[PDB]
Amino acid sequence: CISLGEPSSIFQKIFDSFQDLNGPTLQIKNMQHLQKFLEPYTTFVVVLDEMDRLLHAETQSVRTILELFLLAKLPTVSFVLIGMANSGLLPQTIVFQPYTAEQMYEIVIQKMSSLPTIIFQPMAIKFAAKKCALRKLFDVLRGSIEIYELEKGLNYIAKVFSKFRTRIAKLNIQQKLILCTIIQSLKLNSDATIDESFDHYIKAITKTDTLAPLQRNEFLEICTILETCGLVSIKKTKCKGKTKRFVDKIDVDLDMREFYDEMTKISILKPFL
Amino acid sequence: MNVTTPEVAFREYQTNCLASYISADPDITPSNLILQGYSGTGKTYTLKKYFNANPNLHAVWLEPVELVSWKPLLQAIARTVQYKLKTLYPNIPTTDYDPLQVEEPFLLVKTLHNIFVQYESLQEKTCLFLILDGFDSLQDLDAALFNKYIKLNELLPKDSKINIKFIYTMLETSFLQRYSTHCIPTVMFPRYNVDEVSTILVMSRCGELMEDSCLRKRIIEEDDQFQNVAANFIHLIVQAFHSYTGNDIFALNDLIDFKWPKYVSRITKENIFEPLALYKSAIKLFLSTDDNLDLSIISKYLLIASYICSYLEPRYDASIFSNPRYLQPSLFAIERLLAIFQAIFPIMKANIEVFQNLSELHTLKLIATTMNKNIDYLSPKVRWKVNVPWEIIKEISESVHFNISDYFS
Amino acid sequence: TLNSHVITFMTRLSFTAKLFIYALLNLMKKNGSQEQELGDIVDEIKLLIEVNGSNKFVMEIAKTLFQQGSDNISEQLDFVLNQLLDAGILFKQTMKNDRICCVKLNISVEEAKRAMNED
Amino acid sequence: DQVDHIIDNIEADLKAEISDLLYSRCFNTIFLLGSDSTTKIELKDESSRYNVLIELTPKESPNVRMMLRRSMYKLYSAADAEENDVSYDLSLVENFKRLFGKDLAMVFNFKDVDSINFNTLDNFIILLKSAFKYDHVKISLIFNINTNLSNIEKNLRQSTIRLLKRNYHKLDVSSNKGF
Amino acid sequence: YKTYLLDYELSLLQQSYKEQFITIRLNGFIHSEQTAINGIATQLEQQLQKIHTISSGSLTEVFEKILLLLDITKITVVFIFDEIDTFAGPVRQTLLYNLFDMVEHSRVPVCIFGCTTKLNILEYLEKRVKSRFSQRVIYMPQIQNLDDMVDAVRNLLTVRSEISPWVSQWNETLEKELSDPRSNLNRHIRMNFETFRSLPTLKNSIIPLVATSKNFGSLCTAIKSCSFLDIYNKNQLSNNLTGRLQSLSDLELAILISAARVALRAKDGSFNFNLAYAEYEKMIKAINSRTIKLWLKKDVKNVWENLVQLDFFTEKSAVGLRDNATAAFYASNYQFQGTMIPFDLRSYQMQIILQELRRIIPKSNMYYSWTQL
Amino acid sequence: FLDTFEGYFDQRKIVRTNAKSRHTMSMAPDVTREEFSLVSNFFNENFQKRPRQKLFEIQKKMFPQYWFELTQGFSLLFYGVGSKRNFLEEFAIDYLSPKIAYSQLNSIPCLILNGYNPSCNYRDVFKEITDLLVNHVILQIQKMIDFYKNQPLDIKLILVVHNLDGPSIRKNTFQTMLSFLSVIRQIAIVASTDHIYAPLLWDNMKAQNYNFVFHDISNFEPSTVESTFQDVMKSGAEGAKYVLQSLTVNSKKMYKLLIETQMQNMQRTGVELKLFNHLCAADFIASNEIALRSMLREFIEHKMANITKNEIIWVPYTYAELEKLLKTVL
Ligand SMILES: Nc1ncnc2c1ncn2[C@@H]1O[C@H](COP(=O)(O)OP(=O)(O)OP(=O)(O)O)[C@@H](O)[C@H]1O
Ligand SMILES: [Mg+2]
Ligand SMILES: [Mg+2]
C-alpha cells in the first residue's frame, strides 16, 4: 500500500497483477468495475501490506478500507483479503505476540543451521535475546562480527549494547555555566525565551565576579552545542501575555538527578546550581 | 532639459515639478515617480495637458483598477509596451510575443528583455513612460507588490536604447509612508479650498451649460448674458453644498446636473436680469440635497421579537412577559425567539406559517446569523441575531400599533 | 565575526532616529508590558519637548521637528519608522491604524540603553 | 387552462413593460421590486447595434475577478454565434468596434440582489463606469430587489448612489401588484 | 549606497576585463523560490553567447544542468543577490545551500555579493548554510560628523570639466555658500542631518531647484536664498494628518470633533455613526442657544463616507493592507462582519485624539471651545 | 408552568452551583458493542410488534390517496415520530411504480436519495438524473423547466429522497437544486422530514416551487438504518487491552505497578514523578533514571496516564472497571 501513488487507485494495481498482458487492459474506477471482473472466475489471493496507510490523512478517511472489506464479504465471487496492519462482517483479528528470550534464541540457531561452523557462544545469544525483547536482534549480532574483525565470546555480546552523565562530561567548563543558568531560569519563570535567558545568565555571574561575560551574539553558539548533543531543545511557539507574538522559546529534556551530581564533583561552582 | 511647461489653474508648483523629472533624456530622468494625491486634486488633468503640449515624449497609460487581480497587470504591461513600440517605429521588423505568457514577476523581465534587443537600431536613447494611474486602487493589494516594481530597472540591461519609466498615482497617505525609506521623488497634490473649487467648476462647466438644449428652448418659449446666468448657478450651488460635499469635484458635479433642468424652467422674462428674484423663486433647490433621486402581519411581529432578543438579556425575561441599542446586537436561539413572539402576538401555536415568514426574513438580509455562505438552519450551534437599525424597527412597530419603546425605557 | 554591529549602528543615527529609541525605552520603565502602541510614542515625544519650552536653548529644535524652519508649514503631529523595521531592530504588527499599532523590540534591552548614553 | 393563460399573460406584460423602460454617459438602472429573477428578458434586434443580455447570479459571483471574466465569456460567445482568441477583460469592450463593426449595448441583469454580497457589487459598478469614454458602449443595469429600496441604499457607498441616480426608474412588479 | 557601489565595480572591470567574467543579477522580491532556479539558467544563456540549451525542459531538468556546469583560464560567475533576507526562510534554504556550495567544493570561481537590510543576517541562516559561508559581513558606514555631509554635497555639484563658460562662476558661488555656516545651504544640510541623515533623500530637492532655473541669474539666486527649498518641504507635509484638516469645511470639522469626544470618554474608544450624531446634534443646539443650519441625518451619510476615504476613521480590529500576497487572497474570500452590519452600527476608531486637534486648530475658529472636554 | 410561552421562562431559572449534581459516566454500567446490537434488534422486532403492524396496515389504506396527489403536481412530504424508510420504499415501488406504468398506456425508475449520509454531494445526484431522463448544474435544470412545459403530463422519473433533515440535504446548495426539479410536472417528489425545523429551510420562494403536502404518520419507528451512521457508543476500556498485549513482557510490568499504586486509595492523587522511580529501586525493571522518558512518552500516546502537575499524574478513569484490568494483565 505504501508503494503506490494514490490510495484510491488500489483497484487498478490488482487488475494488472491478475489479468494477462496479452489480453485487453481495462480501467477500474471503484467497486462497480472490480466486482464484475471476479464474477465469472479461481481463488484470488492478495497480500495488502501495511493497510494503516490507506486512510486519507472520519467519514471520508475510512473509505478505501471500508470499500475493500465489502468486496471480500459478499458471495457469488471468490476474493480473499489478507492484510498486515501495524500496531457481523468483521475480520478475524490476530495479535502477533512479540518474541521473548527463548523465542529469539531458537530463530538464531534455525537461521544459521546451514552454516558448517558456528563461531557464536551459547551464552552470548541468550543475553542479546532478552535485552532486545526480530529486527533489533539482527543489528546486535551483526555489529559484534564487524567489531571483532576490526580489532584483530561472552564479552562480544556486551560490547554491541554499550557502543551504541556522558553528555555532560563531553562539554567544557564554560558551556556548563550557561547550561546551569538555562535550567535555573526555567524554574523561577517557567516559560522563558532566548532573550530572557541571556539576561538571567549575565546577572547571575556578576555577583560572583568570576569569568568574563559574553555578548548576545555569541550566546547562541553555546546553546547550539547542547542541542546537537541532546540536552536543550529549542522550539518556536508564541507568547501568553499582551504581546502574543512569535518568539523562540528554550526548553530542556534532561533529568534533574544526573544534573545535580556531575557539576557538584568539581567543587568549584555552588551558587550557579 | 528642453521641454514645454503648460499653464494649469492653481497648479503652478505641480506643473514645474513634472518638468524637472519627466524629460526626453534618460540620463536626467528618474526611474520612479510617485504622484500622491487624494480624489479631486487634479492628478489626471495636470498629466494630460503636460503630455499634449509636448509631442516628443512617448507615454503609455495603464489603468490597474480595470484588472482586479495582479495577474492581468503583468500581462497588460507587456501588451501595451509592444503595441506602443509597433506604431512608433513601423520601419523596424520585430517579433510579436504572446502577452498571456506573463504569469510570474520573473517572466516580466524575460518578456521585456526579448523586446528591447530588437530595438537597438536607433540612434539616441528613447524613453518609455509607463503611467500607472491608480496603483493603490488595485483590488488584491499587498505590501510586497510595490517592492517588485521599484526594482524592475535594476534587472534591465543598462546598455539598452529604450529605458522604461514607472509613474505611480497614489491616493491615500499611509500607503506612501510604507516606502518612505526608498527615497523616491514624490509630488504631492493638496486639496483645493473654497476659492479654487468654484473657479475650476466655472472654467469647466460654462461651455456645456449655456449651450444645453433646455436653456435654448426656454428663451424661445417665454452670448454674454447667458455666461453670467450659468456662472451664477455654479456659484450658488457650491455655496449651498460646501458642507454636504466638502471639496470633492465629483460630489459637486452631480448636484449641478440634478438641479440644472429644475433651475432653467424657473426662469421667465423678468428673472433674466434680476438675480434677486430668481433665487427666491427656486428656494427648494438650495435648502436641501433632494436625497438622490408591504410586509406581512407575521413577518412584522417576528422582527419585533428578534429586536428584543438581540438587545436584552434572557435572564430577566421571566418578569416582563410572564443604551444597549447603540452597540452590536447579540445572538439568540430559535426557541428563544418563538417564546417572545407568541407572547407579544395578539389573540397561536408555532405552525409552518411562522417558520415560513422566519425563513423569508433571512433572505432579505433582515436578520444576521453566524455563517454567510452555505448556512445550515438545522445546526444547533448556529445562532440568529437581528440585522435592522433602530429607525427601521421603529416604523414597523408603529404600523401594527405596538409599543416597542416601552420595553427599553 | 564575534562583534555586534547593532550597538554602533544606533550611535550613528540622526536625532529623529535616536529620539524614537529613547522614547520607546522610557515607556517600558513606566508600565512594563513590552508592548507600546504607536500613539503612546508620539505623545511621549511631545511630552519631552515641552519640558523646558520657556528656555531658548530647547525651542531651537521645536521649529525644525514640527515646522522645518518655515512659517507657512503648520505644526506637524515616517522615515525613521520604516528605517528601523528593515534593520531587524524594531518590529511592527500588521495594523491599518497608526495609534493602536503595537511596537515591539527585536534586539536586546541591555544593548539598546548603551547606545542612548553614548550620545 | 385559464390559469396557464394567466401565467403566460403575466410574463407577456412584464416583458413589454421592461422593454418600454429599457430603451425609452450614465447607467440605465431599473429596479424590479418584487421580482424573484424568474422572468426571461428578450431584447430587440435593431440594426447596426448588437444587444447582449448578461445574467449574473450570486453563486457564480464569488469575487470581482470572476465577475468580469464571466461577463466577457457570454459577450464574446453571443457576438460570435450571430456572424481568434482574445482576453476576458475590459479590453474586449473597448476593441468591440474594431473586431465586429457594430455598436455595443450590454444589458446586465443582476439576479437575486438580496442574496449577493454588497462589497462585490459595489466594485463591479465602479469598474464598469470607465466604459463611458468609448462613445459606442452603453451599459444598462437591472436589479431584482425583493425587499425594499431603503435596505439596498445603506449597503452602498456615496459614489455608487449618486452615480446610479442619473437615470434610475422604479418598476414594482410583485406577485400581487395592486391585486 | 549599496547597489551604487556594486554597479561602479562592475563598470570599472568591464573597461579592461570584459571577457573574463559575466553578470548574474538576482532579486529577493521579484524572484520567488521556484522562479530563482529558472532565473539563473536564463541569465547564463544570454551571457555566454555575448562573450564568445541550459534553460530548456521542465524545472527538474533546469536545476540538473546548473549543477553540472558550475560544480587559458576560467570564467568568473559573479552572483549579485538582492534582498537575501527573503530567501533565508526558517523552513528551508535550498538556494542558499546550493549557492554556497559553488565556492568551497566547486573549482569554478563564483563571487556571490549579497545585499540585504537585516543587521543580524547570520542568525537567519541554517546550521549547514552558515557553515559554508566565509562569515564576510561588510557593514556599510553611515554619516557620523557634520563635515561628512558637506563634502558629499560639494562633490555632487562641482563641475570638474570645461564644458560650459559658467563653470568657473558656478564653482565660486557654491564654495562661498558652503564655507559660510551662516548661509542658507548650510542650514538645510544641518536640518536634514539631524532629521533624515540621508544623501538620496536630500537629493530629491536639489534636482528640481536647478531644473526650474531659466538662466544663470536665477540659479545663483535660488542657491543663495533657498526659496524653493521651503516650498518643497511644505508640499511633502501637505497631504498628512495636518494638511488634510485645513481642506475641510465647517461640517467636516464638526463631525470629527464630535466623534473624537465619544471615543475619548469611552473605555476602548469604540464609536459608530449613531454615537457621533448625538454629540453633533447637542453641539448645534448649545451654540445657537447663546444661525447654524442643522443638517438632517440623511445628509451626514455623505460626509461620514468622505472622512473614511480621507484616512480619518479606521475600522475597529481591522488588519487593512496585508504583508505578502498569500494573506491578501484569503482575506478577500472571507466576508467580514463589518460589511453585513449597516453603516450606522459599524465600530470605527479615531486616527487623531482630541489632544492633538487642539494644537492644529487656531483660536479664530468657533469650534475651538468644544475641543477641551 | 409547562406549556405555552409561560413554560419557557419558568423552566430556565438560574440554578445554583451547590444545587447541581456531579454524577458522570463512572457510576453507569459499561456495555460493549456486541451486546448493544443483540438487544436493539430484539426490541425492534418483538416489543409492540402487533400495535406497530396494525397501525402500519391502517396507513396502507392511504396509498391510493397519496397517488392521487402526485398526479396533480402536489409533492409528498411525510413526517411524524420515527423513521419513514420502510414506509417510502414499500409505497414508491410496490404501489407507485405499477400504478403509474399501468395508467399511461417496463416499470418507472425510482431514484432513492440517501439524505442521512453526510457524503452526499450535489454533482453525483444530478449525474443519474440526466442519464435516466436524457454552476452548470443549476443552469441545466433551468433549461429543462421550459422544455418540459410543452411536453404532455407523464411521470417518467420518481424521486424518493430519504431523510430530508440530514447534513447533506440541509445545505443551501442542494436545496435549490431539488426545488427547481419539483416544478417539473413530469417528476414526482417524495421526501420525508425528521427534524422539527423542517419548514424553516424553505421560504416563500421555495414553497411555491416545491408544492409539498404534509402527512403525519407517527409510526414510532426505532430507526435502525440511520442509527448506524453515527458514533452511538460514544477512555477506551477494550482498546487499552490490545495495547498491552502487543507490548513486551517488561512493558506490562511498568503499567501494573502504576495501576496498583493509583487504585490503592481512590484519596491518593496518583503517582508522583519521583515516586515511579522509587518502585524501580525495589524491582529491576528499567535501566537508570534517564530512561524514564522512553516509557513516559509511549503511555501518553495511547491515552492511559494523563499528567496533572499542580509531577503528580492521574488518568481520568474510575476504579469500577479498572479492577477487571488487573486480572487480564496477570
Ligand atoms: N486645476 C484645474 N483646473 C481646471 N480643471 C481642473 C483642475 N484640476 C482638475 N480639474 C478637472 O477636474 C476633473 C475631474 O478631476 P480628475 O478626476 O481628473 O482628478 P484626479 O485627481 O486625477 O482624480 P482621481 O483621484 O480620481 O484619479 C477633470 O476632468 C479636470 O478637467
Ligand atoms: Mg485620475
Ligand atoms: Mg539596492
PDB file of N, CA, C and O and ligand atoms in Angstrom, chain B residues 8-11 37-49 63 133-134 137 169-171 189 192 196 199-201 203-204 248-250 253, ligand 1:
ATOM      1  N   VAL B   8      -1.411  75.524 -15.910  1.00  0.00           N
ATOM      2  CA  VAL B   8      -2.542  74.871 -15.261  1.00  0.00           C
ATOM      3  C   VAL B   8      -3.064  75.783 -14.162  1.00  0.00           C
ATOM      4  O   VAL B   8      -2.285  76.454 -13.474  1.00  0.00           O
ATOM      5  N   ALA B   9      -4.385  75.810 -14.000  1.00  0.00           N
ATOM      6  CA  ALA B   9      -5.001  76.670 -12.999  1.00  0.00           C
ATOM      7  C   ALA B   9      -4.726  76.138 -11.597  1.00  0.00           C
ATOM      8  O   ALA B   9      -5.030  74.981 -11.290  1.00  0.00           O
ATOM      9  N   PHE B  10      -4.144  76.991 -10.751  1.00  0.00           N
ATOM     10  CA  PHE B  10      -3.842  76.661  -9.356  1.00  0.00           C
ATOM     11  C   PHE B  10      -2.926  75.446  -9.239  1.00  0.00           C
ATOM     12  O   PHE B  10      -2.958  74.726  -8.238  1.00  0.00           O
ATOM     13  N   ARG B  11      -2.102  75.209 -10.256  1.00  0.00           N
ATOM     14  CA  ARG B  11      -1.155  74.098 -10.260  1.00  0.00           C
ATOM     15  C   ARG B  11       0.189  74.571 -10.803  1.00  0.00           C
ATOM     16  O   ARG B  11       0.809  73.927 -11.651  1.00  0.00           O
ATOM     17  N   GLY B  37      -1.821  61.872  -4.184  1.00  0.00           N
ATOM     18  CA  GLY B  37      -2.884  62.856  -4.130  1.00  0.00           C
ATOM     19  C   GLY B  37      -4.260  62.231  -4.027  1.00  0.00           C
ATOM     20  O   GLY B  37      -4.551  61.242  -4.705  1.00  0.00           O
ATOM     21  N   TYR B  38      -5.116  62.801  -3.182  1.00  0.00           N
ATOM     22  CA  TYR B  38      -6.454  62.273  -2.980  1.00  0.00           C
ATOM     23  C   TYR B  38      -7.351  62.625  -4.166  1.00  0.00           C
ATOM     24  O   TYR B  38      -6.925  63.246  -5.145  1.00  0.00           O
ATOM     25  N   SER B  39      -8.615  62.222  -4.076  1.00  0.00           N
ATOM     26  CA  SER B  39      -9.567  62.490  -5.143  1.00  0.00           C
ATOM     27  C   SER B  39      -9.913  63.973  -5.199  1.00  0.00           C
ATOM     28  O   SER B  39      -9.965  64.664  -4.178  1.00  0.00           O
ATOM     29  N   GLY B  40     -10.151  64.461  -6.415  1.00  0.00           N
ATOM     30  CA  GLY B  40     -10.481  65.858  -6.607  1.00  0.00           C
ATOM     31  C   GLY B  40      -9.314  66.810  -6.501  1.00  0.00           C
ATOM     32  O   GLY B  40      -9.521  67.998  -6.234  1.00  0.00           O
ATOM     33  N   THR B  41      -8.088  66.328  -6.703  1.00  0.00           N
ATOM     34  CA  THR B  41      -6.899  67.166  -6.616  1.00  0.00           C
ATOM     35  C   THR B  41      -6.331  67.545  -7.978  1.00  0.00           C
ATOM     36  O   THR B  41      -5.448  68.405  -8.042  1.00  0.00           O
ATOM     37  N   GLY B  42      -6.809  66.931  -9.055  1.00  0.00           N
ATOM     38  CA  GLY B  42      -6.320  67.259 -10.380  1.00  0.00           C
ATOM     39  C   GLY B  42      -5.056  66.534 -10.782  1.00  0.00           C
ATOM     40  O   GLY B  42      -4.142  67.152 -11.342  1.00  0.00           O
ATOM     41  N   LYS B  43      -4.973  65.230 -10.510  1.00  0.00           N
ATOM     42  CA  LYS B  43      -3.787  64.468 -10.885  1.00  0.00           C
ATOM     43  C   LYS B  43      -3.798  64.106 -12.365  1.00  0.00           C
ATOM     44  O   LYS B  43      -2.758  64.169 -13.030  1.00  0.00           O
ATOM     45  N   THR B  44      -4.961  63.726 -12.898  1.00  0.00           N
ATOM     46  CA  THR B  44      -5.053  63.371 -14.309  1.00  0.00           C
ATOM     47  C   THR B  44      -5.102  64.600 -15.207  1.00  0.00           C
ATOM     48  O   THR B  44      -4.648  64.542 -16.354  1.00  0.00           O
ATOM     49  N   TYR B  45      -5.642  65.716 -14.707  1.00  0.00           N
ATOM     50  CA  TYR B  45      -5.720  66.925 -15.521  1.00  0.00           C
ATOM     51  C   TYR B  45      -4.343  67.545 -15.725  1.00  0.00           C
ATOM     52  O   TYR B  45      -4.038  68.044 -16.814  1.00  0.00           O
ATOM     53  N   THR B  46      -3.500  67.522 -14.693  1.00  0.00           N
ATOM     54  CA  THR B  46      -2.153  68.070 -14.799  1.00  0.00           C
ATOM     55  C   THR B  46      -1.201  67.158 -15.562  1.00  0.00           C
ATOM     56  O   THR B  46      -0.097  67.594 -15.907  1.00  0.00           O
ATOM     57  N   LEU B  47      -1.595  65.914 -15.834  1.00  0.00           N
ATOM     58  CA  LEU B  47      -0.762  64.982 -16.580  1.00  0.00           C
ATOM     59  C   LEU B  47      -1.139  64.887 -18.050  1.00  0.00           C
ATOM     60  O   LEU B  47      -0.263  64.649 -18.888  1.00  0.00           O
ATOM     61  N   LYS B  48      -2.419  65.067 -18.384  1.00  0.00           N
ATOM     62  CA  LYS B  48      -2.830  65.019 -19.783  1.00  0.00           C
ATOM     63  C   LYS B  48      -2.404  66.278 -20.527  1.00  0.00           C
ATOM     64  O   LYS B  48      -1.964  66.206 -21.681  1.00  0.00           O
ATOM     65  N   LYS B  49      -2.525  67.442 -19.884  1.00  0.00           N
ATOM     66  CA  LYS B  49      -2.123  68.687 -20.530  1.00  0.00           C
ATOM     67  C   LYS B  49      -0.608  68.801 -20.638  1.00  0.00           C
ATOM     68  O   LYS B  49      -0.103  69.507 -21.518  1.00  0.00           O
ATOM     69  N   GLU B  63      -4.452  51.491 -16.628  1.00  0.00           N
ATOM     70  CA  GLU B  63      -5.382  51.602 -15.508  1.00  0.00           C
ATOM     71  C   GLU B  63      -5.401  50.293 -14.731  1.00  0.00           C
ATOM     72  O   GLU B  63      -6.061  49.330 -15.153  1.00  0.00           O
ATOM     73  N   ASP B 133      -1.900  55.054 -13.616  1.00  0.00           N
ATOM     74  CA  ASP B 133      -2.897  55.910 -12.977  1.00  0.00           C
ATOM     75  C   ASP B 133      -3.729  55.074 -12.014  1.00  0.00           C
ATOM     76  O   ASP B 133      -4.652  54.364 -12.422  1.00  0.00           O
ATOM     77  N   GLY B 134      -3.405  55.155 -10.726  1.00  0.00           N
ATOM     78  CA  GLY B 134      -4.130  54.412  -9.716  1.00  0.00           C
ATOM     79  C   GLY B 134      -3.479  53.091  -9.362  1.00  0.00           C
ATOM     80  O   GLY B 134      -4.036  52.023  -9.635  1.00  0.00           O
ATOM     81  N   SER B 137      -5.207  51.690  -6.102  1.00  0.00           N
ATOM     82  CA  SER B 137      -6.614  51.374  -6.315  1.00  0.00           C
ATOM     83  C   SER B 137      -6.841  49.925  -6.724  1.00  0.00           C
ATOM     84  O   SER B 137      -7.990  49.540  -6.963  1.00  0.00           O
ATOM     85  N   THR B 169       0.401  56.933  -9.356  1.00  0.00           N
ATOM     86  CA  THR B 169      -0.507  57.970  -8.870  1.00  0.00           C
ATOM     87  C   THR B 169      -1.261  57.399  -7.673  1.00  0.00           C
ATOM     88  O   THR B 169      -2.345  56.829  -7.821  1.00  0.00           O
ATOM     89  N   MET B 170      -0.684  57.555  -6.484  1.00  0.00           N
ATOM     90  CA  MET B 170      -1.308  57.054  -5.271  1.00  0.00           C
ATOM     91  C   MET B 170      -2.451  57.971  -4.839  1.00  0.00           C
ATOM     92  O   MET B 170      -2.587  59.107  -5.301  1.00  0.00           O
ATOM     93  N   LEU B 171      -3.285  57.457  -3.935  1.00  0.00           N
ATOM     94  CA  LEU B 171      -4.443  58.194  -3.440  1.00  0.00           C
ATOM     95  C   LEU B 171      -4.356  58.455  -1.942  1.00  0.00           C
ATOM     96  O   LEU B 171      -4.511  59.602  -1.513  1.00  0.00           O
ATOM     97  N   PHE B 189      -0.205  66.255  -3.962  1.00  0.00           N
ATOM     98  CA  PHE B 189      -1.293  67.039  -4.544  1.00  0.00           C
ATOM     99  C   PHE B 189      -2.263  67.432  -3.438  1.00  0.00           C
ATOM    100  O   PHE B 189      -3.123  66.623  -3.046  1.00  0.00           O
ATOM    101  N   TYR B 192      -7.985  71.375  -2.939  1.00  0.00           N
ATOM    102  CA  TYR B 192      -8.314  72.771  -3.167  1.00  0.00           C
ATOM    103  C   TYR B 192      -9.201  73.306  -2.046  1.00  0.00           C
ATOM    104  O   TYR B 192      -9.849  72.553  -1.313  1.00  0.00           O
ATOM    105  N   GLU B 196     -10.617  77.873  -4.935  1.00  0.00           N
ATOM    106  CA  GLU B 196     -10.136  77.180  -6.121  1.00  0.00           C
ATOM    107  C   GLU B 196     -11.124  76.151  -6.653  1.00  0.00           C
ATOM    108  O   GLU B 196     -11.061  75.810  -7.840  1.00  0.00           O
ATOM    109  N   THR B 199     -13.714  78.135  -8.826  1.00  0.00           N
ATOM    110  CA  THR B 199     -13.094  78.649 -10.042  1.00  0.00           C
ATOM    111  C   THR B 199     -12.855  77.542 -11.061  1.00  0.00           C
ATOM    112  O   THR B 199     -12.908  77.792 -12.271  1.00  0.00           O
ATOM    113  N   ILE B 200     -12.596  76.318 -10.597  1.00  0.00           N
ATOM    114  CA  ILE B 200     -12.380  75.205 -11.517  1.00  0.00           C
ATOM    115  C   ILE B 200     -13.692  74.789 -12.170  1.00  0.00           C
ATOM    116  O   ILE B 200     -13.747  74.533 -13.379  1.00  0.00           O
ATOM    117  N   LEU B 201     -14.772  74.727 -11.386  1.00  0.00           N
ATOM    118  CA  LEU B 201     -16.062  74.317 -11.932  1.00  0.00           C
ATOM    119  C   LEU B 201     -16.621  75.349 -12.904  1.00  0.00           C
ATOM    120  O   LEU B 201     -17.418  75.002 -13.781  1.00  0.00           O
ATOM    121  N   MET B 203     -14.732  77.318 -15.067  1.00  0.00           N
ATOM    122  CA  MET B 203     -13.996  77.181 -16.317  1.00  0.00           C
ATOM    123  C   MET B 203     -14.125  75.797 -16.941  1.00  0.00           C
ATOM    124  O   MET B 203     -13.478  75.535 -17.961  1.00  0.00           O
ATOM    125  N   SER B 204     -14.935  74.909 -16.362  1.00  0.00           N
ATOM    126  CA  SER B 204     -15.119  73.566 -16.891  1.00  0.00           C
ATOM    127  C   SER B 204     -16.567  73.209 -17.189  1.00  0.00           C
ATOM    128  O   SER B 204     -16.802  72.233 -17.911  1.00  0.00           O
ATOM    129  N   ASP B 248     -14.869  67.929  -2.854  1.00  0.00           N
ATOM    130  CA  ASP B 248     -14.800  66.942  -3.921  1.00  0.00           C
ATOM    131  C   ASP B 248     -15.372  67.516  -5.210  1.00  0.00           C
ATOM    132  O   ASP B 248     -16.327  68.297  -5.187  1.00  0.00           O
ATOM    133  N   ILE B 249     -14.778  67.123  -6.336  1.00  0.00           N
ATOM    134  CA  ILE B 249     -15.247  67.606  -7.631  1.00  0.00           C
ATOM    135  C   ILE B 249     -16.395  66.747  -8.145  1.00  0.00           C
ATOM    136  O   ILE B 249     -17.335  67.255  -8.766  1.00  0.00           O
ATOM    137  N   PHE B 250     -16.341  65.436  -7.895  1.00  0.00           N
ATOM    138  CA  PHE B 250     -17.406  64.552  -8.359  1.00  0.00           C
ATOM    139  C   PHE B 250     -18.690  64.750  -7.563  1.00  0.00           C
ATOM    140  O   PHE B 250     -19.787  64.601  -8.114  1.00  0.00           O
ATOM    141  N   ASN B 253     -20.262  67.984  -9.016  1.00  0.00           N
ATOM    142  CA  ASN B 253     -20.666  67.935 -10.417  1.00  0.00           C
ATOM    143  C   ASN B 253     -21.990  67.203 -10.597  1.00  0.00           C
ATOM    144  O   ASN B 253     -22.743  67.510 -11.528  1.00  0.00           O
TER     145      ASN B 253
HETATM  146  N1  LIG G   1      -6.679  72.997 -11.841  1.00  0.00           N
HETATM  147  C1  LIG G   1      -7.717  72.574 -12.570  1.00  0.00           C
HETATM  148  N2  LIG G   1      -8.258  73.422 -13.472  1.00  0.00           N
HETATM  149  C2  LIG G   1      -9.295  73.007 -14.205  1.00  0.00           C
HETATM  150  N3  LIG G   1      -9.914  71.824 -14.183  1.00  0.00           N
HETATM  151  C3  LIG G   1      -9.360  71.006 -13.283  1.00  0.00           C
HETATM  152  C4  LIG G   1      -8.286  71.291 -12.455  1.00  0.00           C
HETATM  153  N4  LIG G   1      -7.985  70.202 -11.651  1.00  0.00           N
HETATM  154  C5  LIG G   1      -8.868  69.301 -12.005  1.00  0.00           C
HETATM  155  N5  LIG G   1      -9.730  69.717 -12.986  1.00  0.00           N
HETATM  156  C6  LIG G   1     -10.815  68.949 -13.589  1.00  0.00           C
HETATM  157  O1  LIG G   1     -11.263  68.001 -12.650  1.00  0.00           O
HETATM  158  C7  LIG G   1     -11.907  66.952 -13.392  1.00  0.00           C
HETATM  159  C8  LIG G   1     -12.015  65.718 -12.530  1.00  0.00           C
HETATM  160  O2  LIG G   1     -10.766  65.519 -11.835  1.00  0.00           O
HETATM  161  P1  LIG G   1      -9.878  64.240 -12.093  1.00  0.00           P
HETATM  162  O3  LIG G   1     -10.681  63.005 -11.979  1.00  0.00           O
HETATM  163  O4  LIG G   1      -9.146  64.414 -13.424  1.00  0.00           O
HETATM  164  O5  LIG G   1      -8.785  64.331 -10.940  1.00  0.00           O
HETATM  165  P2  LIG G   1      -7.759  63.340 -10.231  1.00  0.00           P
HETATM  166  O6  LIG G   1      -7.189  63.927  -9.001  1.00  0.00           O
HETATM  167  O7  LIG G   1      -6.744  62.905 -11.287  1.00  0.00           O
HETATM  168  O8  LIG G   1      -8.686  62.085  -9.917  1.00  0.00           O
HETATM  169  P3  LIG G   1      -8.599  60.640  -9.235  1.00  0.00           P
HETATM  170  O9  LIG G   1      -8.195  60.760  -7.804  1.00  0.00           O
HETATM  171  O10 LIG G   1      -9.995  60.037  -9.431  1.00  0.00           O
HETATM  172  O11 LIG G   1      -7.594  59.867 -10.096  1.00  0.00           O
HETATM  173  C9  LIG G   1     -11.070  66.791 -14.658  1.00  0.00           C
HETATM  174  O12 LIG G   1     -11.892  66.453 -15.769  1.00  0.00           O
HETATM  175  C10 LIG G   1     -10.404  68.167 -14.843  1.00  0.00           C
HETATM  176  O13 LIG G   1     -10.867  68.825 -16.017  1.00  0.00           O
END
